[PDB]
Amino acid sequence: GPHSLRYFVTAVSRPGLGEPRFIAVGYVDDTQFVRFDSDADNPRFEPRAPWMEQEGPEYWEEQTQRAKSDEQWFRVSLRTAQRYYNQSKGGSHTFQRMFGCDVGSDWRLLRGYHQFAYDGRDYIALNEDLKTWTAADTAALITRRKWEQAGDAEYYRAYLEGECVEWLRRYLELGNETLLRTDSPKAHVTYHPRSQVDVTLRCWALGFYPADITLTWQLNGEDLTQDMELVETRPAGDGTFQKWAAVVVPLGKEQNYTCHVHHKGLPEPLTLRW
Amino acid sequence: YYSIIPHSI
Amino acid sequence: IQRTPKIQVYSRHPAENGKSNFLNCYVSGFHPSDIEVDLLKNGERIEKVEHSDLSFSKDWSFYLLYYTEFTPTEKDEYACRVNHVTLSQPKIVKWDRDM
């Protein structure tokens, strides 16, 4: 089965309040395992999963240093972006970075990531070839040309193919007890009175892992969505996830509606009724 | 493992 | 340029009175990152509340899980209060054991 290592890094400028906020979090699949928070009591790379408390000081010391390096460069980037777009020095802006790797069941690189955002919009992204860049605007075109000339792609690729994949395999060994699990969703349909003409059927999905799931309602074998309400997947808090989808249906014909659940842990997909 | 960016945008 | 947060108030395990559970408030899909999130017991702000580390999705929008240990009763009303630049006033979402 495939696995992913991902880091989500956020910098938020706040002039008149002080230095920019900087936070990095790491994930293995849908499981967080590390964090760095500039606003914490003692800012450092620290474990966020019990199986990471194994690693010694040489891990966290080196990780903390790398984070603080990026913190400084994220500060410059924020300033540079403000210059690029001719924005006011007084306003608060965001700079985001996501990177990591996807590996296949054969323990090899499937896809590497190195992409950036300004104020929640795409800025620049390392393409799937890990050689070329996609720039979202003409400002990012300036960045792209600078990073092309600097040879950044080969530098990132070196990490993505080597360091990223190897340490991911290490994490999958450290947390082999919990990370390699696959909890199929326990699903059901709930009845809730609405009007005197119709009723609400809420299809539930509980306690599943990973978080990737598919929930749909189909009437008489066809399909329905444009009326369907679908909340985004939510963490239960115990490492599992929840999700539901509801439909408004007239009285008496509830059993002509089928909820369909697709998930990694379900060999045969689920078909449910009230 | 965390990896750094080498410079600004 | 801005995204409004999606708010969900729910329990970690199915709620039955007398048994200690966890009250969750999941806020997701919002931008920018500054956000106020409180868990309310009978309209009163709960102090002993923890939250997840700021993270984001594929579209760069942020998400945060706020949670607190509690023991549900039949009369204790629980809710989540969220304020954000996209909201003209704080949104109060009551906890419903079924939605």
Q: What is the total count of domains within chain C? A: 1
**Residues 6+ positions from C14 with CB-CB distance below 8 Å:** none
Range of the domain at C93: 1-99
**Residues 6+ positions from A23 with CB-CB distance below 8 Å:** A9, A10, A35, A36, A37, A38, A39, C53, C54
Q: Which two tokens stand for residue A85?
A: 């777009």
Distance from CA of A168 to the nearest CA of B (A): 8
3-class SS at A161?
helix
Q: Which two tokens stand for residue A239?
A: 């490492």
Q: How far is CA A92 from CA A43, A78, C32, in A?
A: 22, 10, 9
3-class SS at C3?
strand
CB contact under 8 A, B9 and A140: yes
Which of residues 184 through 243 in chain A touch C, CB cutoff 8 A? 190, 192, 202, 231-232, 234-238, 242
The minimal CB distance from A231 to the residues C8, C62, C98 is found for: C8
For position C11, which CATH number holds? 2.60.40.10
For residue C78, what are the β-bridge partners?
A: C41
CB contact under 8 A, A63 and B4: no
Instruction: Count CB neighbours of A155 within 10 A.
Output: 16
Among A61, A77, A145, most B C-beta atoms within 10 A, so best to mutate, is A77
Burial A191-216 (b: 16+ CB within 10 A, else e): eeeeeeeebbbbbbbbbbbbbebebb
Report the distance separating Cα A126 and Cα A112, nearest Å: 8
Q: How far is CA C37 from CA A61, A136, C27, C45, C52, in A?
A: 33, 33, 8, 10, 12
3-class SS at C67?
strand
Report the distance separating Cα C26 and Cα C62, nearest Å: 11
The minimal CB distance from B3 to the residues A34, A99, A116 is found for: A99
Instruction: For residue A203, give the nearest of A142, A272, A112, A115 by alpha carbon.
Output: A272
A66 vs B: CB within 8 A: yes
Domains of chain A: 1-181 (3.30.500.10), 182-272 (2.60.40.10)
Q: What is the largest CA-CA distance in chain A?
A: 68
Report the distance separating Cα C7 and Cα C29, nearest Å: 9
